[PDB]
Subunit: 256 residues, 4 copies
C-alpha cells in the first residue's frame, strides 16, 4: 500500500504503459484518475479499467482530456478534486510517435507530436503542480520520457526532441517546485512491446536486432514500467527529484 490515500492522475491511461501504471497505483491504495484522449477507444479503455479497479476493491474514475488541448490539465485537476479531494501524483504518460522520415516530415505531423508530447505535458504538469502547491502537502510528478531522450532515431526526429524536452522539463520543474515538496522525475522506458511500435516491430529483422541488443533478453511489457512509476510516486523516493530512471533491460548500455 505504497500509495494509500493518494490521488493519482495518469494521462493517456486507456492502454499500454499508462494503463498498467494506473492499474498498479490503484493496487497500491491510490485513488486513480484515469485520463484518456476522449476518442472512442480511449474512453472505452478508461471505463473498462475503472470497472476492473472497482472489481478488486479500489477506487477510480475516467476523465477525458486531450493532451494536445492545453486546457485539459485544469480539467483533470478539477475532476480529481471533485471526486477525491486532492491531487497528489501526476503521471504524464500521453504521447504519440508517428514514425516518419525527416526530410519529408509534414509540418502538421511535427506540430501534432510536439503539441501532444511536450506542450500539453507542460500545461498538464503546470495545473497539477499548482494544485499540489495550494494543498501544501508536497507531491510527485513523473514524466514518461524515453531511452530516446538519450539517443537518436532516424524516423523519430520529430519525437526524440519531445522526450528529451520532457526530461529537461522535469529537471527545471524540480528546481521551481522543490521548495514546495513537489518531486519531479522522468522514467525512460526502453523498447516496450505496445501499440506504439506494433507496426514498427512487425519488421522481424528490426525486432530481432532490437531484441538482441537487450541484455535481459526480452522486450518490455507495460507492467515493467508500473513498479518504477509507483516507486517514484512513493515515499521510497522521498529524496529523489530531478532524476532520470532508465527502464530498458540494459538496451542503452549494450554497445558490445
Amino acid at each position: 500500500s505504497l500509495l494509500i490515500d493518494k490521488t493519482v492522475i495518469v494521462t493517456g491511461a486507456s492502454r499500454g504503459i499508462g494503463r498498467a501504471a494506473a492499474r498498479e497505483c490503484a493496487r497500491q491504495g491510490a485513488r486513480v484518475v484515469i485520463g484518456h484522449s476522449g476518442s472512442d477507444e480511449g474512453r472505452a479503455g478508461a471505463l473498462s479499467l475503472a470497472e476492473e479497479i472497482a472489481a478488486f476493491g479500489g477506487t477510480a474514475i475516467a476523465v477525458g482530456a486531450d493532451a494536445a488541448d492545453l486546457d485539459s490539465g485544469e480539467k483533470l485537476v478539477a475532476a480529481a478534486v471533485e471526486a477525491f479531494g486532492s491531487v497528489d501524483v501526476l503521471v504524464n504518460n500521453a504521447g504519440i510517435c508517428p514514425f516518419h522520415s525527416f526530410l519529408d516530415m509534414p509540418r502538421e505531423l511535427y506540430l501534432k507530436t510536439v503539441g501532444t508530447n511536450l506542450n500539453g505535458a507542460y500545461f498538464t504538469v503546470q495545473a497539477a503542480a499548482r494544485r499540489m502547491k495550494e494543498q501544501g502537502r508536497g507531491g510527485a510528478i513523473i514524466a514518461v520520457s524515453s531511452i530516446s531522450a538519450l539517443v537518436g532515431g532516424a524516423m523519430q526526429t520529430h519525437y526524440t526532441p519531445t522526450k528529451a524536452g520532457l526530461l529537461s522539463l522535469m529537471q527545471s520543474c524540480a528546481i521551481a517546485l522543490g521548495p514546495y515538496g513537489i518531486r519531479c522525475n522522468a522514467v525512460l522506458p526502453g523498447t516496450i512491446a505496445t501499440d506504439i511500435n506494433k507496426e514498427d516491430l512487425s519488421d522481424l529483422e528490426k525486432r530481432e536486432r532490437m531484441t538482441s541488443r537487450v541484455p535481459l533478453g526480452r522486450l518490455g511489457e507495460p507492467d515493467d514500467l508500473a513498479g518504477p512509476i509507483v516507486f517514484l510516486a512513493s515515499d521510497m523516493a522521498r529524496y529523489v527529484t530531478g532524476a532520470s530512471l532508465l527502464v530498458d533491460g540494459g538496451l542503452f548500455v549494450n554497445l558490445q
Copy 2:
C-alpha cells in the same frame, strides 16, 4: 582557411554568439549568409556585419528570416544558393529566453519560445539538409543548444526543453543524414554575457554566484563560441557527428 569556399548559414546572427560565429566563419574563408530576425535592429546588425566582412576581404549577405516562421528555412537556403551556389554548413543559432516563473507561464510566451527555439530550428535544419543531400558533397549542421540541455533552470521551464530538444534533434538527424555525409552536432554554451542575460545578471548576487562557479574564473563572451563552431563545421571534425560540446569554462562540472 578552415572553411575556405564553404557556404555557411548562421541564423539569428545580428548580435551575440551568432554574430561572432558568422564573423569568424568569414575570417576562415567561408561565404556567410547572415540570417536575422527581420526586426529593425536585426536588419541593421546583419548589414553592419556584412559591411565589416567585405572590409577585411570576405563575402557575405544579410537575409531576413523569422525563426518562428517555419518557412524561413527554405528562404535562407534559397538566398544562399542564389548568392553563393551552395549550402555547406548551417549554424542554427536563433533563440530567445524570456525568463519567467513556471506556475504563471502564459501559453503565448511558452508557445513562442518553443516555436522560435525548436520548431523553427527543425524546419531550418530540414531545408538546409535537403539542399546538402541534393548536392552530394556532405555538410555540417551545428545547433546552438546550452548547458541548460543538461541541467535545469527554475525560470527557464519553457526554455530548457527547447535546448534539450535541439540536442536530441542533432542526435536523430545525425542518424538520418549520416548516409549523406551530413554531420549534425550541438554546441552547449555555458553562461555567456550577452543580451539574453544582461538583465538577469544585473542582479549582482546572482552574477557572483554564477561567476564564482566558473572554474576558468570568468563568464564567456561570444567569441568563446566561435572556435568550437568553426571546429565542428570544419574537416577537423570529419568523424564527429551526433556529439555535444560544452563550452562553459567548467561550469557544468563544478559541484565543489
Copy 3:
C-alpha cells in the same frame, strides 16, 4: 516484504548509508549479511545492527571483510551461503573519500582510494555474481556510486573516478550478466550528511552553499537511500538494469 526470503549482502554496513540500507532490507524480509571493515568500530556497529534486526524479528549476521582486500568478496559470499544458503542481492556500499588537493596527492592515498572504492568492488561483484549465476535464479547488484560520477570535485580527483568507475562497471556487468538474469544498477547519492563529510561540511560557508543548492531544501540522511536501494533490489525493478538513479534532492540539476 519486498525482499522476503532474499539473501542480501551489504558491504561497509556498520554506519551511514550501508547501515540504513541493511536495516531496511531486513525490514523488507531479507536475510542480511552485514559486511564491515574489520576494524573495532566496524565490528561493533555491525554487531549492534544484527542485535537490532533480530529484535524486530529479522535475521542477520556480521561478517568482517576489508573491501581493499580483493579476496573478501568470496569470503562474504561464503559466509552468506553458509548462513542463509544463497546470495540474491549485493549492495556494494563500502567506500572512503579522504579529501585532498590534487597536485600534492600522495600515491599511497590515491591507491587506497581506488583499491577500496573500485578494485575491491570489482571482485566483490564478481564473487557475488558467480554465486548468482550458479544458482540459476537471477539476482540484483546495486553499486553505491555518487552524484560525483557525473560532476567533478577539486578535492576529490582521486575519488570521483572511482564513483564514475563503479557506474561504468554496473553498465558493463549489466551486459555480461543479463543472460543470467542478474540486474546491475548504480545509485547516485547527492550530499548525504554522514561521517564521510562531517569534517568537510563543518565549514559553515560550504555547508550553506551546498544546502542552498538543494531544491528540496535539506541535505540527505542515510535513510534517504534505503528506499531507492530496496527498489532496485526488488521485483519493482525487474526490467531495470544498467541504470543510474540520482538520489540527491535535485542537487545535480540546480544551476539557477
Copy 4:
C-alpha cells in the same frame, strides 16, 4: 599553425591514435614529446615518428615512459623541459584493452588495466599540471577516454571503468586547475580500427554489426582523432574545460 611554439607531450604515441595526434600536432607547429612504453616496438615506433617529423621540418623527441610506472609522468615533464623549455599540452593516450570475460577475470589482468589506463594517467596528468602551474601561462590537458565511458562492454568490465574514470578525472581536474588557466577535457573515440581491436573485429559478424551502427558508414581511423585533439589543445577551445567530445561517427546515438 594552431599549436606554434607549444610543447606537446603525447603518451603511448608509437602507434594508433597517439601516433596520429603526435604527428598532426607537429604539423600544427608544436614541439612534440613522443612518449612510448619503452618496449622494443614502442621505442622503434617513436623514433620513426620523430624521424618523420624531422623530415617535414618540425621538431620532436622520443621519450620512453611506461604509463603503469607511476613515476614516468615526471620523467616525461623533465625531458620536455630539457629539450623544449616548457610543457604546454598533455595528451594522455596510453592505454590497453585486453578483452576478457568478467567472471574469470584474473586479478593481475584487472590490476594492469587500471594501473596503465587510469592510475598512471592520474600521475602523468599530475606531473604535467604541476609544470603548467609553475610556468603560469595556462595549459591544455586532453585524456583519450572512450564511447565506452558512456556505455558498457561485456568483455570490457575491467576497461570501461578506466575510461569513465579518465573522463571523471578531467572533470575534477578542470575545477582544481581552472584558476591556473589549465583546461582539462576528454575526447571519446568510438570504434577506431587500430591494433587495440584488430583481433576483436577480425570476427566479421561483429565487425559488420559495429559498422552498421555507425551513421557515417565507416569505422574510424587514427587521423579521425587528430583534429579533435588539436582543437582541444588550441586557442579555438579557450573556454572549453571539463568537457567531453565524442568522435564516433554517430555510433553512440544510433539506437534505431
